[PDB]
Design a protein around this ligand. Structure first.
Ligand code: HEM
Ligand code: HEM
Lengths: 384, 384
C-alpha cells in the first residue's frame, strides 16, 4: 500500500516541486514513469552549476505547469514540442534528479565530497547486464499521470541542454490501471500477476522515513547529502511465456504470497505478517521464497528496510524471440550498503531467478530537495 | 475527426466483436494499441482451421469481458495471467485479425484464393527496413482503453497457442491523452506535435466506407474477401531531436498545415479544405508538402483515399544514441494498389523524408467479420 497511488485522470493536480526533500520518492506513484539517464557534457564545475541551475528552472516550471512557450518568430524552432497543445498542465508530474558515481571523478573536482557508500553497479550472480543500459552521470525519474506529460518533460529538457546533456539510456513504464485509479486503496500489480509494494514501510510516517529513506546528520556522509537518499535501479526482464506456463502452486511458493489475496501463504489478509519462527523447515513460506529471503523479519536487521517505487514495463521482442516485459525496479534508502546491496546479496539464489533477468540500471544518489526559489540542485554540494 | 476517439476511463464499455466487419477498423481510437505479428506454426490446412476457430472463441470472450477464469486445481498453470485482477473488463478491447501474403504459400493451399492486390512489402526509396520488424503470417491489432487490457489479451492468446503461434515482431502504441479524453472532438496529436487525422474520410458514413475501405462484389476479388479490407502498416522512426531543433516555419512548410490550429496554411479552421487549383506554384501549400502529395484533391485522387488509424510510439534509445520514437502507421483501403501503394508512390521524395525513417511493417488483408457465435475467422476462405 505505501506510498499509495494517484489518479491518471487528475490533469490539474500538482505535486510540490519545492521541499526539504525531492518529490517522487514518498510521492504516491503516478500512472506513468520514465527513467532516462544522461551523460554530462559539462566542461567544468562552473558549467556544471549552469546545468543544475538550468534544471531547477525547468523542473519548477514543468511541475506546476502553465501556458506553453509560444514562438513569435516562426524562423526559430518552437520553444515547445506542442505535443500537449497550448497549455502544459502539471498532471502530477514529478522529476527526481540523481547523480551517478562517475560524476565524482577528475572532471568536476567532487571526489572528496562523494557519498560514502556510493559505488558503480557491478554484476550479481543472475545478471545479464547490458552496458547500453547501465550507469550514467545523472538519472532523471520522470513521473506523471500520463505518458504525454513525461515525454513532454524530456524533450523540453533535451531542447534546453544540447551542449550540456547527452541521452544515455531510457525506459518508460506504468503502474496497473485499476490500482492507479484506486487512489492508494489497492496495491499495484506486476506483470507476473502479484501484488507488489505491500510490505513497504509506511511512507506517510515522517519519523520512520528519517530512519529508512532520508540521509540524516548522524551519518558519516558529507553534509550536503543530508536530506537526500541513495537510489538503486534495476531493469529486470521476465521470462513471461515460461511464467504463464508455470503452476499456480509454484508461482505462490516462489513468492511466498497468495496471488489473489496478497496474504502471506497460510494467512488471509494482504497486510498479514508471517512468522518464520514457526516455519523453520520453510514448509508454509519457503526459505527459497522472495519474501522470506528479502526480509527474514528478524527486526535485528530492520536496518535493511527500504521504500520500493517500481513500475511495470512492456517493450518489444528479445533477441531470443520472446516478449520483452518486466519490472523497472526503483528503491530509496538512507544507506545503499545497509539497504539494496544487503537485500540483493540476500536474494542471490532465490527460486525467482529462474524467471527473471536483471539487465540494467545503476546506483545513484538522489539530491536534497530545493528549499525555495533561490536554491538550486546541489547548491550545498557546490559551495562548502 | 474520423475515426474519432474513446475514453481511457471507460472500463465497462464494450465493442461488438461479431458482425459484417471486424472491429478496430472503423472503431473510434482507444488510448492503447499493440501490433503483433505471428509466424503461424500450423502444419496443414486442418491445423489452420483449428487456429482460426480458437482465435474466434478467445477474442469473443476477451473483447466482451467477464470474470477471470478460475483455476480450481493449483497444480496447473493459472488459466488467467491475473494482471487484470479478478475481472477481465471489456475496456473497449477490439482485436483485429489480418493475414500476410506468406500465408498463401504451399503450406495450406490457399494460393488460388489469395486477394488480388496482396503482396510482400518491398522498399520505397527512403526505407531502412529491418528484417526483424517486417511481415508475418498473421498480424493482430489489439487496442483498448489501457495498456493493461492489451497486454492481458496477448498473453491469453499466446498461452493458448504454443503449438500454432510464434511471436514474430511486436510494437505498442498510444494516442495523445487529451484527445482520447475528448471522445472525437479533438484530432490526435502525433509526436512531432502536429494534428494527425484531420482529413480522414467519414467513418460513420455508411455509404462512403463501402467505396473506400471495404471490399465489395463490384471489384473482382475472391468472394470470401467481401467485407474485409487491405491493411498497410508502417513502423516509422522520427528524428526527434533534429525535428525539435528545426524552425517552426519549416515544420509547417513540410506538412503544409498550421501547427497550432491544424488549419490548412493560409486558412483559419482545422476542417478547412485546401485550394490547390488556386495555387499551382505552391506558395501557400508546398509542392513537396505531405498533405498536397498524399492527397492532391482532384478527380483521379478520389480513388486513392484511405482511413488512417495510426498511433504514436515511444521506446528507448536507438543504437546510435538518439530517441527511439515515431508512428505506428496503420491504414485501411478497399484496394492496396489503389490505396497505400498509390499514395506512397506520390510521397516518394517529399520533404518529410528528412525527418522520418520507415524501419518495419507490412501488408496484410484484414478478414471479414465473424458473422456470429456460429461463425469463425476466415470460414469462407477455408470451406471451399
Ligand atoms: C525480480 C523482480 C521482482 C519482482 C517481480 C518482485 C515482486 C515482489 C513481490 C510480489 C513482493 C511481495 C509483496 C510486497 O511488495 O511486500 C515483493 C516483496 C519485496 N521485494 Fe520484490 N520483486 C522483485 C525484485 C526485487 C529486488 C531486486 C529487490 C531488492 C533486493 C526486492 C525487494 C523486496 C523487498 C524488500 C520486499 C518486502 C519483503 C517483506 O518485507 O516481507 N524485490 N517483491
Ligand atoms: C511518420 C510519417 C507521417 C506523419 C508524421 C504523418 C502525419 C500526417 C499529418 C500531420 C497529416 C495532416 C493532418 C491530416 O490530414 O490527418 C497527415 C495527412 C495525411 N497522411 Fe500522413 N503522416 C505520415 C505518413 C503517412 C503515410 C506513410 C501515408 C500513406 C502513404 C500518409 C497518408 C496521409 C494522407 C492520405 C493524409 C490526408 C491529407 C489530405 O488528404 O489532406 N501519411 N499525415
Amino acid at each position: 500500500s505505501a506510498p499509495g497511488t494517484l489518479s491518471p485522470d487528475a490533469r490539474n493536480e500538482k505535486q510540490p516541486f519545492y521541499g526539504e526533500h525531492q518529490a517522487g520518492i514518498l510521492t504516491p506513484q503516478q500512472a506513468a514513469m520514465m527513467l532516462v539517464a544522461f551523460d554530462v557534457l559539462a566542461s567544468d564545475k562552473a558549467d556544471l552549476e549552469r546545468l543544475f541551475r538550468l534544471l531547477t528552472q525547468r523542473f519548477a516550471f514543468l511541475t506546476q505547469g502553465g501556458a506553453a512557450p509560444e514562438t513569435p518568430n516562426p524562423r526559430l524552432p518552437p520553444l515547445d514540442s506542442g505535443i500537449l497543445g497550448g497549455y502544459i498542465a502539471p498532471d502530477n508530474l514529478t522529476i527526481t534528479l540523481s547523480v551517478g558515481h562517475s560524476l565524482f571523478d577528475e572532471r568536476f573536482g567532487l571526489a572528496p565530497q562523494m557519498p560514502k557508500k556510493l559505488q558503480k553497479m557491478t554484476r550479481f550472480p543472475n545478471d545479464s547486464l547490458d552496458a547500453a543500459l547501465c550507469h550514467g552521470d545523472v538519472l532523471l525519474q520522470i513521473c506523471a499521470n500520463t505518458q504525454d506529460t513525461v515525454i513532454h518533460a524530456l524533450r523540453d529538457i533535451i531542447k534546453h541542454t544540447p551542449d550540456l546533456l547527452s541521452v544515455r539510456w531510457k525506459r518508460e513504464g506504468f503502474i496497473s490501471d485499476h490500482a492507479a485509479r484506486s487512489k492508494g486503496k489497492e496495491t499495484p500489480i506486476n506483470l507476473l500477476g502479484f501484488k507488489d509494494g505491500t510490505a513497504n514501510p509506511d511512507s506517510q510516517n515522517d519519523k520512520l522515513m528519517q530512519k529508512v529513506v532520508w540521509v540524516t546528520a548522524d551519518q558519516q556522509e558529507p553534509a550536503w547529502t543530508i536530506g537526500g537518499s541513495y537510489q538503486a535501479v534495476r531493469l529486470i526482464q521476465f521470462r513471461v511465456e515460461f511464467w504463464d506456463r508455470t503452476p499456480l502452486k509454484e508461482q505462490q511458493t516462489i513468492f511466498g504470497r497468495d496471488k489473489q489475496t496478497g496474504a502471506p501463504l497460510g494467512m488471509q489478509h494482504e497486510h498479514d505478517v508471517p512468522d518464520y519462527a514457526s516455519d523453520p523447515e520453510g514448509k508454509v513460506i519457503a526459505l527459497d521464497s522472495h519474501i522470506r529471503l528479502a526480509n527474514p523479519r528478524t527486526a535485528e536487521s530492520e536496518s535493511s528496510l527500504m521504500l520500493r517505487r517500481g513500475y511495470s514495463y512492456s517493450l518489444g521482442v528479445t533477441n531470443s524471440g520472446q516478449l520483452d516485459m518486466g519490472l523497472l525496479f526503483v528503491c530509496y534508502q538512507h544507506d545503499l550498503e545497509k539497504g539494496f546491496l544487503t537485500v540483493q546479496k540476500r536474494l542471490n539464489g532465490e527460486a525467482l531467478e529462474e524467471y527473471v533477468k536483471p539487465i540494467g540500471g545503476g546506483y545513484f544518489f538522489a539530491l536534497p530537495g530545493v528549499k525555495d526559489a533561490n536554491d538550486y540542485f546541489g547548491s550545498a554540494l557546490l559551495r562548502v
